[PDB]
Amino acid sequence: GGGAHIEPRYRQFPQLTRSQVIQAEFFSATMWFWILWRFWHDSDAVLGHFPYPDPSQ
Amino acid sequence: DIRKMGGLFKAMPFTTTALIVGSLALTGMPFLTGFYSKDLIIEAANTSYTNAWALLMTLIATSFTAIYSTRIIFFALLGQPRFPTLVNINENNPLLINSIK
Amino acid sequence: MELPDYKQWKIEGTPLETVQEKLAARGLRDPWGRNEAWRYMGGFANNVSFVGALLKGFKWGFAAFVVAIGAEYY
Amino acid sequence: ARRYLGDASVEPDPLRMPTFPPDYGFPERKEREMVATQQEMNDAQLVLQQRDYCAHYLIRFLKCKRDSFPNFLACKHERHDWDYCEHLDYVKRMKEFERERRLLQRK
Amino acid sequence: TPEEKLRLQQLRELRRRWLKDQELSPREPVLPPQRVSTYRHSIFAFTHVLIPVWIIHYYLKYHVTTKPYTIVEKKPRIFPGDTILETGEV
Amino acid sequence: ASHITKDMLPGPYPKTPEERAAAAKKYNMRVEDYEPYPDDGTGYGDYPKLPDRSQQERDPWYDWDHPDLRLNWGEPMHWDLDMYIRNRVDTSPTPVNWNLMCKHLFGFVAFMLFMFWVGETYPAYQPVGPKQYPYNNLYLE
Amino acid sequence: LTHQQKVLRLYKRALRHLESWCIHRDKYRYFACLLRARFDEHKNEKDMVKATQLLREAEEEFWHGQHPQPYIFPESPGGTSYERYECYKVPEWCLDDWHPSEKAMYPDYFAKREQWKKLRRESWEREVKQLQEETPVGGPRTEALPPARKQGDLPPLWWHIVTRPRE
Amino acid sequence: TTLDPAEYDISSETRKAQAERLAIRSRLKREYQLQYYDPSRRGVIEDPALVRWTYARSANIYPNFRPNTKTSLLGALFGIGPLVFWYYVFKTDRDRKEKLIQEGKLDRTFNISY
Amino acid sequence: APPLTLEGIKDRVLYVLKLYDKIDPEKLSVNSHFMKDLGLDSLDQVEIIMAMEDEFGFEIPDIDAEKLMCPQEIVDYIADKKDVYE
Amino acid sequence: MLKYIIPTIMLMPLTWLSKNNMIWVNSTAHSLLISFTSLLLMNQFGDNSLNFSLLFFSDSLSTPLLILTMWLLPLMLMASQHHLSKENLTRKKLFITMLISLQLFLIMTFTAMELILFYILFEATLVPTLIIITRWGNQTERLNAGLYFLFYTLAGSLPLLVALIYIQNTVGSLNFLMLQYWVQPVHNSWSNVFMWLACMMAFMVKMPLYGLHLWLPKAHVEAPIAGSMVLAAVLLKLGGYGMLRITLILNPMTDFMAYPFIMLSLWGMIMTSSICLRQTDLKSLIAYSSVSHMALVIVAILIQTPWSYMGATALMIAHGLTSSMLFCLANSNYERIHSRTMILARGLQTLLPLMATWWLLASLTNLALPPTINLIGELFVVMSTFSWSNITIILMGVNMVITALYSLYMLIMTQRGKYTYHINNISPSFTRENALMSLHILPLLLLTLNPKIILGPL
Fold it and tell me: Where in the cell is it found (chain A)?
């Protein structure tokens, strides 16, 4: 037929290709590195604060 | 079916990273993609003549945005493997991995 | 091709399969024991749980954080 | 809405401003707060609710934006100071619930 | 029930007998029959895009001034970088 | 070219045992409660003797149901009674006759009153009386 | 349905709707004997009204506790991608209208077909007429003698015997 | 709601004398397959239940009809009824809209169409 | 596309039926007639098809229960369902 | 003009005069040719309409409508061929003659120059049609379709000739439409209603209102072999256009009573399409389409104010094709399986794959996807009939819903698995099956490119 290139599993938990996961894991950085600049430099709110307009005079 | 799924890693290393990125992103965008989309709404138009119900109503829907995700994450990516034997899974697929990436 | 051979699992392990003891106060006990215990063991005992599932090592974060911080840097 | 008198030209979508449209104004501070030149206000392309305060200021913002085309950042201090023009305006307009609060109370 | 003995075990030698007849692939059973008969691959992208890009613009350069009011393109949105002073900054 | 007595004739009582089954067996014994009776409320020419009606309803159910075919595909020889609404209808649900939807569809109707108010955030409620003042109250300057 | 086997159709589904309620694979397994306990509580007693209360009250406590969206076993009487593949369906006897030059292909297969027909060309004279001997008058379920007493050819030929496969 | 639909009822043991409800059908599927399996046919089957399905439905009513029961004089509540209604709705409009087109001008002057 | 044969079905069915400690794995596999291992009327026939559904997983029709006397009979027609051996 | 009647009557002894079986191809060959003549001098103006003779202006009028009429003839002999090959040649020579004998008057009519050549030629059919229905029927219920087809059409069209002879001697001469340049109005009386009612109701009994259509499915359900004259009787009906020549003038100013023809057919339009959903006979199912979005023109015509004639003309020839072609499908699929019962044919679309896209493009043009003629013929209806009163948007807005469930249920009934017992249905649509089924969708959609050739003057 087509080919044998991988056999199935009886729940012996098949093996990976070893370039399958590493090539992916470099994209586990792109969320954890690109999350860098969140708190640097930005705070929970970069706003300025309303100073309670006391001068009703 | 969300039954008979199993856990996060059985020969699905890359695709399960695609879920937990996106399915995180849709949750209110902490630094991610739509950080300018859902986030710039309830913080802007929320100062207006709003019906004082949608404020109650909408922001509550924001909650379920978590349990939307985490449910289909935790039955598929979390629990013990459950599904009949002879499972052939192969993720090495040039015509697929090319697409997600 | 004879790979699905018996005389293999026959539960020892599986704190979830220790309810055979829990039901021994009534008793059945296991039988049939190892069917739901087919894959119960092996590398399926780990199954990474909460945020460590969605961290995936937190690898590049605290190592590559200052990777750009910083070269001049004044 | 300061001067309520008529309009020589009838052009609505207030191409007839009172003089320049404020948000409300004045009443006292600032009696004449002063904005920008109208002849240049709609001479450029300027949307409505771009005719509020800080017109002079924000007309410069886009000037540099058009300067460096293959660039993602022009001035993050000006856009920051664009609040410092606007935030200062808006907070100056947070004072209208302060006066009416204690002014419309007992006397 | 026992009674199905003489029956359907004929089918096992009948159904699986038809299916037995079924699977065939020697001698290339598509004859086909007859008959006769990447770097470049640089004109395929050219026959693709470069034929239209010619044709479409030949319908424009000869055109835009033909229609009395054709494409409507908007104003330049001039900024005080030409004849003007600022003057603020205020 | 079926010759004589093709379909129903002037019932619905012309010797009930003569019809089912002379031909067209709706009932076996002429009483299955399939006897060509169901001319309920006659004088309406509708459904004469008719080796036919009120045989029950809600679907052919289209499942294993496998003597041969038995429902919507495979066409058992002759049962046909009434049809043509049967390809857009099924059987019993889990609950029964609870309109909680008119409840929920009116659930928000509670919040109609939440419409007559506004949501203005700043300032708070601060129980007031004559403090409201949307725009102005007293003198301008 | 004979009164004996009437619990089976419940005994089949009873645990069936159970598993779609439980989550962990042990959960189904741990409640097995525990809920299995209730069946044989009265194991041997009357077939009639005495134990009909094992049928009678089985109605409630089942339908009550029903529809947690059961697991449907996808290819089956219902549920997703069951009858899915009809784009083939194997229209057996597609071999009629051809206009050869479309018949050049599979010559060995065209040879085989006309060899099957000889059975159905004449198997009848004793195939049909035996059904006039076999069923005396009003016979219930209609299959022939299981052998047909010497060689069935097929006899049910070929509509049930050659019928269409799945891919 | 629509319907119970009675997936359990009384039984057991009465009406176990009722048999040959299948003998009715079992006769045919024997005869039908006795029809349906033959070498030389090439054609559709009579299937009388279909012949008696249309012909006892489309035709064979005005023959069966009688104009008597006042549940067959019902239709005046159905056929003519709303057809009067649609006159009542319209004829008020086309007038209410007309009166204003004379005294007072509702439209604008950039309506040429119509 | 997944390759299927008639051996595994003689093995798998032999397998889990030999997994249950209720059955000694010296007992007959292909033919026991199952009436020796039918005890009792219930809790066998429908009991044994409870597990065998957990591997293949098509529906296990009701009226096919009474074919389950012969241990070669169960494996017999499972070939005809999923389109198994030639 | 004689450019047309003379060759098409010259056709008449092109047929019998021939030999044996060459006959069909002999006349089908020529009968196509006349279509060059059809356009030939036609599709002149335009403005200040063409009248080339005393008693003929062929079609100027911007009601071109005549080019189709000359199409459908050599679409019949490709259509009608199936079971008519089984009786004698001297009879087969007849059925081609009377069929032409129809085609000759439909060229005479639509021109007519006047009222009184119209009528005697408006009633001049029913001699050729009635003879095709009664002979070469199928069922024995045909014999009643013979009567019902008369005793309506003729029943109230006699009050024309009482009225049109009443006008001829009242005001000047009706000899010519092109002189109405003197027309006085019709104010009111208990006499003039009748005049307006006599000059009208004869036309309604052809294009049905929801009353007095009782004949239309009686004749179509049971009717000749191929739809051989059933394609023609879907030309005949729409040819009640002449109400466009009258009601424009010749009692212009009574709209007073229009309302019983509005609210009567406007609530039937939402109606008889809905009594078409449970039909068990297919050539019935199409016959009730033909009422529905035909009967929409009767609320287009009565209202004045063009943008209706922009949209009322496109409709007469809108379903002129689509409603034609469906009777051509349901014929073919009937050749193979001899029941017209819709249920019986199922499990097709596997066995005749190429004829899949034929059903679809047909059933898609009742849906009226926006680009084709169909909508651009409906959306000039809704635009004026909205201005009448705003509420018309509802009912005729419902028409645009029930008609969509209507069409699909006819296609989607032929997507199912059925192998079932049929050993028939082998023929994989030999070319004529798919040839004559074309020459509809090719010419139909095509017109949308330059659709100024189907429009009125307004």
Answer: Mitochondrion inner membrane
